[PDB]
Amino acid sequence: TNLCPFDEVFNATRFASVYAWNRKRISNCVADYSVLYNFAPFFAFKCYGVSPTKLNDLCFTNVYADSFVIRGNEVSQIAPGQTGNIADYNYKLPDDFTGCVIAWNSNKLDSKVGGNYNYRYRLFRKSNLKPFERDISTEIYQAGNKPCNGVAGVNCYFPLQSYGFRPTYGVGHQPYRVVVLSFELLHAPATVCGP
Amino acid sequence: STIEEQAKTFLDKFNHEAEDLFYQSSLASWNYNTNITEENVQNMNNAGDKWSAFLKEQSTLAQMYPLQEIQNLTVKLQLQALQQNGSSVLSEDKSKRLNTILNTMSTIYSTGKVCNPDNPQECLLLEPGLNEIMANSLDYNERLWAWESWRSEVGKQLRPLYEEYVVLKNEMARANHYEDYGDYWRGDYEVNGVDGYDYSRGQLIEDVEHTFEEIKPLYEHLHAYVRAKLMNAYPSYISPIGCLPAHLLGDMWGRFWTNLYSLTVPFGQKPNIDVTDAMVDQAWDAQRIFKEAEKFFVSVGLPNMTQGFWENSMLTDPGNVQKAVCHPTAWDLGKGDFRILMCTKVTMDDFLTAHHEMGHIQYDMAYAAQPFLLRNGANEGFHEAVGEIMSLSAATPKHLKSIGLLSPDFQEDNETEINFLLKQALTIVGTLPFTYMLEKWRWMVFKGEIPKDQWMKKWWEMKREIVGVVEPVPHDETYCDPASLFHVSNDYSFIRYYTRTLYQFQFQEALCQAAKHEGPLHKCDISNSTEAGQKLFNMLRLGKSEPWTLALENVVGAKNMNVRPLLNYFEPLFTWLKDQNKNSFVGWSTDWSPYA
Ligand SMILES: *[C@@H]1O[C@H](CO[C@@H]2O[C@@H](C)[C@@H](O)[C@@H](O)[C@@H]2O)[C@@H](O[C@@H]2O[C@H](CO)[C@@H](O)[C@H](O)[C@H]2NC(C)=O)[C@H](O)[C@H]1NC(C)=O
Ligand SMILES: *[C@@H]1O[C@H](CO)[C@@H](O[C@@H]2O[C@H](CO)[C@@H](O)[C@H](O)[C@H]2NC(C)=O)[C@H](O)[C@H]1NC(C)=O
Ligand SMILES: *[C@@H]1O[C@H](CO)[C@@H](O)[C@H](O)[C@H]1NC(C)=O
Ligand SMILES: *[C@@H]1O[C@H](CO)[C@@H](O)[C@H](O)[C@H]1NC(C)=O
Ligand SMILES: *[C@@H]1O[C@H](CO)[C@@H](O)[C@H](O)[C@H]1NC(C)=O
Ligand SMILES: *[C@@H]1O[C@H](CO)[C@@H](O)[C@H](O)[C@H]1NC(C)=O
Ligand SMILES: *[C@@H]1O[C@H](CO)[C@@H](O)[C@H](O)[C@H]1NC(C)=O
Ligand SMILES: [Zn+2]
């Protein structure tokens, strides 16, 4: 029997930055959520709408798995109705969201001595971000009244900035890997549900 | 767009590249301070150079936002710190000359040696050497020899440098829109803006003078008692109505009077409290000392220590394998990294130093959420005050009996109390007039009220009038005695000690009132009192985001520096001293001199 591919999402070797997060569509399979309870240390396992125990006997149409990596003190920012840099310029959740959020520490895999500068996030954006939207543009942000002409300088900034993760940081500044599961039941026949 | 939004964005990009650069400099400095190797020195130098270049480059970019356009009281504070120019307002030649003068004075002070007469093969440095003669000798001529020698060789080689130093440092201050260098130093206590909490740069002098007018009786009685007891060790050199010679105070300058305890003990038969033997007999280590300090801090509601504290901190001497700098220090590397550097030994002194350092660490942890430029104490005085108030509470006999270091059948009498109070007074009360004199003299020198040909004269007219000390031999305008001190040859401010000493007793009185303590103030322990920890935390977590007057008001209820809590601490000693000085003369005359 074809089990759903939850292993290649949770156990992937490399994750993605917040401004370019990874989305995977899951359909035409049977879902076993008990294997999700592996990786015993979970910093956060929260569920809105469905309940974790009753999730097995519920049939849906599609499941979306979204993966990225953030720092420690921003996990509480991955809930409905939150404000901040991550929830306004990087990743936004709807106020009617149904589904689950999982976040766990990855200090032993995403931290290097001297700095891990391969993880980036967005700091400046002209407007807020609509739910489930991606922005991968790298245009110069103008913060004045004079044109930038595509060159960084006075009142002109580069939107994306790195983290630097090092193994001696605190808990709030350590890397955390985050996976968000969203369940959609559309007017198509239900296909995805458990044993 | 408006200037305010532009400034906010600029500060957002600053607060993100400054943290990384500062963390890389701090880690390099820590690595140099644990090991010792040329490679570590090179890395430290490179990191410091990068940090300095970044800060200098970012200071120029902040001069585009006028300060009067912004009304936020939090963006303005960060921009005011960045917009400071410093020595960049001078010409390049003058900047090089000033740096050369500072380096030359530091080198002259650091490597000054005095050779004994008619014997080139025996020369003594300041530390060790003359500092031991001036702290452990009961002779008269030997102390005078070192006292005159240090100010004859080292002192007279620094005056021409000091004159041009003053001349150059006044130009920078006048170019930075100040009156003089003393105003530049006093600008750290200035509060402009918020109503009901404003503080001017001229109010500090008036406050200091008004406070010092209330310490005079207790200091006079202590001076009389010390003078009476010093006549029995030097029978034919002390006048009963005169001033104390400057070479008989247990220190090279007279900053502290601790080393006179063995000569001035009230009751010499009864020993003090020393828990070193109990510490050794119960197999105590540094780990247990720090665990006890952590437990004491947790007992009042403050949090634990981070897991990185127990892994990245060095609490013992490495040994012969490594080579470290054994000076206690609390490090806040940033990004949640807190560490203590200390070569701990099993002794009461280290037992109190651990409390001091972990108080510093807690105060650092309090404001970790504030912006980078506002992560510091309210002014230059609140940090050591919080450090010391922890050490006062941990030395009480009640606290020692609570943790088992002292026998539970130990009864405290009223004589060891006087011994302890006198030991405290010989260090706390004996240094205030010295500090007030030194800052008053430096302020008057910088202002211009003391002509260059009347420096030393004034330095020896105020000492007889405020401190009550007289020079043993005459001096002329070829000496610079004030330059013989570390904080004068090296550019540093020195009123911070006065402010901290006055703040700490206010804090202790407030916390003891919060803890419902009944009795003398010096028998106070704030352990097992949650209400006394929340009040402290309400001030600890502000940082520089609010004026120091409001931060003080959050703890004491008042918005000004006060002296009465200090006087309530020493009341039994004051009564005992008044009873003891019933057959002596209190006060001194400014006419008697040993060389008359
Ligand atoms: C601080 O309190 C602890 C805990 O004592 C309890 O809590 C207090 C608030 C108070 O209500 C006490 O009556 C409680 O017993 C003290 O530690 C205990 O001290 C007693 C003294 O007889 C001793 O019998 C216990 O074994 C101790 N418990 C331990 C060490 O876990 C502590 O002494 C107090 N600190 C002081 C008084 O300075
Ligand atoms: C720091 O110094 C710079 C120049 O060295 C000051 O900037 C100048 O200020 C004057 C004041 O009238 C202006 O006329 C100039 O246009 C400014 N720019 C230059 C390039 O000279 C700056 O004001 C100083 N900082 C402070 C706080 O005064
Ligand atoms: C993830 O992959 C590693 C490497 O093969 C494996 O040891 C581990 O068991 C995997 N995780 C789970 C939950 O199976
Ligand atoms: C720092 O000290 C450790 C401890 O012995 C040593 O192994 C290391 O080589 C030292 N660093 C340098 C640069 O020598
Ligand atoms: C000052 O600006 C900060 C920016 O975050 C804001 O939070 C604060 O409320 C402002 N102060 C006032 C008095 O509006
Ligand atoms: C502090 O740590 C000790 C031991 O690790 C623990 O028993 C205690 O509950 C901790 N206190 C807090 C407030 O977490
Ligand atoms: C201490 O108590 C004794 C007991 O009567 C008393 O005689 C003495 O005056 C008190 N004070 C001092 C300083 O000894
Ligand atoms: Zn300290």
Residue numbers in the entry:
A (entry chain B): 333 to 527
B (entry chain A): 19 to 614
What does the published report state?
The trimeric spike (S) protein is the major glycoprotein on the SARS-CoV-2 envelope and is responsible for engaging the ACE2 receptor for viral entry, and thus, it is a prime target for vaccine design and therapeutic antibody development. To unravel the underlying molecular mechanism of the S proteins of Omicron BA.2, BA.2.12.1, BA.2.75, and BA.4/5 bound to hACE2, we determined their atomic structures of the S (BA.2, BA.2.12.1 or BA.4/5) or RBD (BA.2.75) in complex with hACE2 by cryo-EM or X-ray crystallography.
Compared with RBD from BA.2, the RBD of BA.4/5 has three distinct mutations (L452R, F486V and R493Q), which displays different binding patterns in the complex interface. The KD of BA.4/5 RBD binding to hACE2 was approximately 9.0 ± 1.7 nM, which is ~2.6- and ~1.6-fold higher than that of the PT (23.8 ± 2.6 nM) and BA.2 (14.6 ± 2.1 nM) RBDs, respectively, while BA.2.75 RBD (7.5 ± 0.2 nM) has a similar binding capacity for hACE2 to BA.4/5 (9.0 ± 1.7 nM). Interestingly, the side chain of H34 adopts two alternative conformations in the BA.4/5 RBD/hACE2 complex, in contrast to the other three complexes. H34 of hACE2 forms an H-bond with Y453 of the BA.4/5 RBD or S494 of the BA.2.12.1 RBD. The binding assay showed that the binding affinity for hACE2 decreased ~9.8 fold when Q493 of BA.4/5 was mutated to R493.
